[PDB]
Amino acid sequence: SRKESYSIYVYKVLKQVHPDTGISSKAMGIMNSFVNDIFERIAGEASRLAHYNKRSTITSREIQTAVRLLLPGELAKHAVSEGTKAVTKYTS
Amino acid sequence: SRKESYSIYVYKVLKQVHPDTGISSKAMGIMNSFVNDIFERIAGEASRLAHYNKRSTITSREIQTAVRLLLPGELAKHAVSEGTKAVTKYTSA
Amino acid sequence: PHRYRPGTVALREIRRYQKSTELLIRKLPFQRLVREIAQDFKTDLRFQSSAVMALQEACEAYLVGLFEDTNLCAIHAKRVTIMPKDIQLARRIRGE
Amino acid sequence: KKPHRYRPGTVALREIRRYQKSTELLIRKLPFQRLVREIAQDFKTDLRFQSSAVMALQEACEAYLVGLFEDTNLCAIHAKRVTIMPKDIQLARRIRGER
Amino acid sequence: AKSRSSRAGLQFPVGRVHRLLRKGNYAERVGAGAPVYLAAVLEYLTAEILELAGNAARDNKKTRIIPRHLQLAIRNDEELNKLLGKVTIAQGGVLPNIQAVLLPK
Amino acid sequence: RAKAKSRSSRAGLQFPVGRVHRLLRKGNYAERVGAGAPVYLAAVLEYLTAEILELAGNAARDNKKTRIIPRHLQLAIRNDEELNKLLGKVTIAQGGVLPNIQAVLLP
Amino acid sequence: NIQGITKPAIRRLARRGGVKRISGLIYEETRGVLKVFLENVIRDAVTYTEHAKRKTVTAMDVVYALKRQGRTLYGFG
Amino acid sequence: HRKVLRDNIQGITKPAIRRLARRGGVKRISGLIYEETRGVLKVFLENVIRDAVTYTEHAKRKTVTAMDVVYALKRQGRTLYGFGG
DNA sequence: ATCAATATCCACCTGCAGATTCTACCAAAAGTGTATTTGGAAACTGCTCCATCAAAAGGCATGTTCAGCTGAATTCAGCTGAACATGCCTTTTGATGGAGCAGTTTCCAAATACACTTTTGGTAGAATCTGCAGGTGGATATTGAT
DNA sequence: ATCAATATCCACCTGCAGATTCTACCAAAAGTGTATTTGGAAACTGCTCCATCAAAAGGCATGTTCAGCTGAATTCAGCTGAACATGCCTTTTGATGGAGCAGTTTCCAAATACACTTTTGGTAGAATCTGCAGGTGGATATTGAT
Ligand SMILES: [Cl-]
Ligand SMILES: [Cl-]
Ligand SMILES: [Cl-]
Ligand SMILES: [Cl-]
Ligand SMILES: [Mn+2]
Ligand SMILES: [Mn+2]
Ligand SMILES: [Mn+2]
Ligand SMILES: [Mn+2]
Ligand SMILES: [Mn+2]
Ligand SMILES: [Mn+2]
Ligand SMILES: [Mn+2]
Ligand SMILES: [Mn+2]
Ligand SMILES: [Mn+2]
Ligand SMILES: [Mn+2]
Ligand SMILES: [Mn+2]
Ligand SMILES: [Mn+2]
Ligand SMILES: [Mn+2]
What CATH number should be reported for the domain whose range is B1-93? 1.10.20.10
Neighbors of chain A with 3 or more C-beta pairs under 8 Å = E, F, G, H
Query: How far away is chain A from the Cα of H49, in angstroms, using its nearest Cα?
Result: 12
Neighbours of H59 (CB within 10 A): 18
d(CA B12, ligand 16 centre) in Å: 16
Residues E29, E21 contacting (CB under 8 angstroms):
no
Residues H82, F71 contacting (CB under 8 angstroms):
no
Element (H, E) at B58: strand B57-58
Domain boundaries, chain H: 1-85
Distance between terminal CA atoms of chain A?
Answer: 38
Technique employed here was X-ray
Nearest to C76 by CA among F106, F100, H22, D95: D95
Contacts across the E-G interface (CB distance below 8 Å): 28
Distance of CA F81 to the CA centre of its chain: 15
Q: Inter-chain contact G77–A29, Cβ cutoff 8 Å?
A: yes
Domain ranges, residue D37: 1-99
Query: How far away is chain B from the Cα of H50, in angstroms, using its nearest Cα?
Result: 23
What class is the E1-105 domain? mainly alpha
Element (H, E) at B36: helix B25-52
* Closest-approaching ligand to the CA atom of F104: 14
| Bases of chain I with protein Cβ within 7 A | 5-9, 18-21, 27-32, 37-39, 48-50, 59-61, 67-71, 79-84, 89-92, 99-103, 110-112, 118-123, 129-131, 142-144
d(CA G27, ligand 15 centre) in Å: 26
Nearest to E38 by CA among E9, E18, E58, E22: E18
Q: What separation in angstroms does the CA of E84 have from each of A34, C62, F22, G41? A: 9, 15, 36, 20
Closest CA to the C1' of J132: that residue is F65
Angle between helices H66-74 and A25-52 (to 10 degrees): 160
Half-sphere exposure of H45 (CA within 13 A, CB side): 30
Q: Which nucleotide is nearest to F34 (CA to C1')?
A: J112
Residues F39, B88 contacting (CB under 8 angstroms):
no
Total number of residues shown for chain E: 105
| Three-state DSSP class for residue G40 | helix
Q: Inter-chain contact G47–B52, Cβ cutoff 8 Å?
A: no
Give burial (CB, 10 Å; 0-12/13-18/19+) of F10: middle
Domain boundaries, chain E: 1-105
Check residue H4 and report its DSSP letter. Answer: P
Half-sphere exposure of H54 (CA within 13 A, CB side): 25
Residues H29, H12 contacting (CB under 8 angstroms):
no
Closest CA to the C1' of I32: that residue is F1
Backbone angles phi, psi at C82, to 5 degrees: -80, 145
Residues F40, F10 contacting (CB under 8 angstroms):
no
Distance, in Å, from the CA atom of B24 to the CA atom of F65, rounded to the nearest integer, reads 11
Distance, in Å, from the CA atom of E27 to the CA atom of A50, rounded to the nearest integer, reads 8
Give the count of domains, chain D: 1
Q: Inter-chain contact F104–D77, Cβ cutoff 8 Å?
A: yes
Domain boundaries, chain B: 1-93
Element (H, E) at G59: helix G59-67
Q: DSSP states of H21-41 as a string? A: HHHTT--EE-TTHHHHHHHHH
Nearest to A40 by CA among G64, E7, E67: G64
User: Which residues lie at CB < 5 A from ion ligand 1?
Assistant: A 59-60; E 31, 33-34
Residues C90, C66 contacting (CB under 8 angstroms):
yes
Question: What CATH number is attached to the domain comprising D37?
Answer: 1.10.20.10
Backbone angles phi, psi at G74, to 5 degrees: -95, 140
Distance, in Å, from the CA atom of A69 to the CA atom of H76, rounded to the nearest integer, reads 10
Give burial (CB, 10 Å; 0-12/13-18/19+) of B74: exposed
Chains A and C touch (3+ CB pairs under 8 A): no
Residue H72 contacts D where some CB pair is shorter than 8 Å:
no
Q: Which residues of A touch F28 (CB under 8 A)?
A: 47, 51
Q: DSSP states of C74-86 as a string? A: HHHTT-SEE-HHH
| Bases of chain J with protein Cβ within 7 A | 6-10, 12, 19-21, 28-32, 39-41, 49-53, 60-62, 68-72, 80-85, 90-92, 100-102, 104, 111-113, 118-125, 131-133, 143-146
Closest CA in chain C for residue D98:
C94
Closest CA in chain F for residue B19:
F57
Longest dimension (CA), chain H: 47
Neighbours of B55 (CB within 10 A): 16
Neighbours of F31 (CB within 10 A): 12
Distance, in Å, from the CA atom of E36 to the CA atom of G51, rounded to the nearest integer, reads 35
Written as one letter, the residue type at C14 is I
Which fold would CATH assign to domain G1-77? Histone, subunit A (1.10.20)
Q: In DSSP terms, which residues pair with G72 in a beta bridge?
A: E87
Which fold would CATH assign to domain A1-92? Histone, subunit A (1.10.20)
Give burial (CB, 10 Å; 0-12/13-18/19+) of E102: middle
Written as one letter, the residue type at E104 is P
**Is CATH 1.10.20.10 the classification given to domain F1-107?**
yes
What class is the H1-85 domain? mainly alpha
Distance, in Å, from the CA atom of B14 to the CA atom of B32, rounded to the nearest integer, reads 13
Distance, in Å, from the CA atom of F16 to the CA atom of F42, rounded to the nearest integer, reads 7
Q: Which residues of D touch H80 (CB under 8 A)?
A: 56, 59-60
Distance, in Å, from the CA atom of B34 to the CA atom of B55, rounded to the nearest integer, reads 29
- The structure was resolved to a resolution in Å of 2.2
Residue G70 contacts A where some CB pair is shorter than 8 Å:
no
